[PDB]
Amino acid sequence: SLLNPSNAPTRYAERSVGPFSLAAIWFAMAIQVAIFIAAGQMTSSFQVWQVIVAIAAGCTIAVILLFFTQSAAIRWGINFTVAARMPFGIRGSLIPITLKALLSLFWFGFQTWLGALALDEITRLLTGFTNLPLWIVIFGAIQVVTTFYGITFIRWMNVFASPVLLAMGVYMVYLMLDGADVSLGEVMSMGGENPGMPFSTAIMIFVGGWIAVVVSIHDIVKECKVDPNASREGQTKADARYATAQWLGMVPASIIFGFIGAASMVLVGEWNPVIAITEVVGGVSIPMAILFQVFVLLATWSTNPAANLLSPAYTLCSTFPRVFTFKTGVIVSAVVGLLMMPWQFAGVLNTFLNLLASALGPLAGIMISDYFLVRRRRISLHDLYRTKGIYTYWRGVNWVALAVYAVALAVSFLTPDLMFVTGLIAALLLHIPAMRWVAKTFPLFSEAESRNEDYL
Ligand SMILES: O=C1NC(=O)[C@H](Cc2c[nH]c3ccccc23)N1
């Protein structure tokens, strides 16, 4: 048996996130340094308005993906890590999940770094003392302790950060434009003086940004509010209402701040607004500096925990259920995370983001397909928490599913600028015959699936 209180499905009465709250989480979750860089570097290949469009487009495909990847977690309250057990093995799932927990972990140490940079700047702008690693640890630690409070903290922290972050951001655009004596419309076409990159791969970069979160949203949305006595059409509007809430959360947030990163690049040659505003205005007071850094910190805190630390936590406490608990998995994830020292990753994000999409495109495709197409939303919680059942396949691993992943990954390389969308579509479609084959050896349903409601 693999069940423990932390890795257990989330009971209807325990659920706490409705549609407004999820929008309020996503809005603050999208406001984070990294998109300055991405949208900034994009000004190299396109002008600002197109970048904004590549952002809105990439945001929209992500949401279309969310509508599907979130449906089982909302309805059944389950983990990502737990949910992967279905198509891949009970243990075989650990392979893609380890890939993904690693990715997830990589982002955590990265943003902790950016956060640390911020706190260290506030202090050295007061005390001149400029030790970074200590502020690294201290921040990693603080996140761990606020993450102990799971989604309860996340949800309260993001509702108050959101408008503040929204305001700090709208202010930023006024200060730049003003101090440079430029209208909004003028800046809207200042970029793109070195074309070469296709616009599709631009969209693919901003999708590649959130692919990890989208593919494992479970860990957030297993906390969402559901009415168990809906219907097919009421369950679908529920899905659509949530997906819509995520759209209104990540789009308007990441457009304003994507634009800020782009504007910085194009006005002054740097994606970082500290520099761009400092120059254009010719220095700023120590308060107003400290301020900016308070922003960065507030913008990191609203993204890192929820987006980067939750899912490996749940991976530990759900694979080693008597060894780890949520809180302990949080401690082990933030330590490994920082010990990956990701701040030394050479290159630029864009290509990394191009890496992230074509690497998880089939994973999202296989999960959407197994649950929606193969099984028809008809799942067995019982067997998900037991070493030997209908999801055990060949001694814990479903090799045919690991094959479909490879194959789809291959075909993906035949269309480099759309890698992700072919690999998703390929994995999606192949899972069907592959699964109609595996179904001749192993059963797709179980009697114990009638105990589903016992869990809830
Ligand atoms: O899956 C992810 N977890 C993270 O922290 C990053 C977030 C992230 C990094 N770069 C971006 C550019 C645009 C939008 C989001 C991002 N991606």
Ligand code: NA
């Ligand atoms: Na944030």
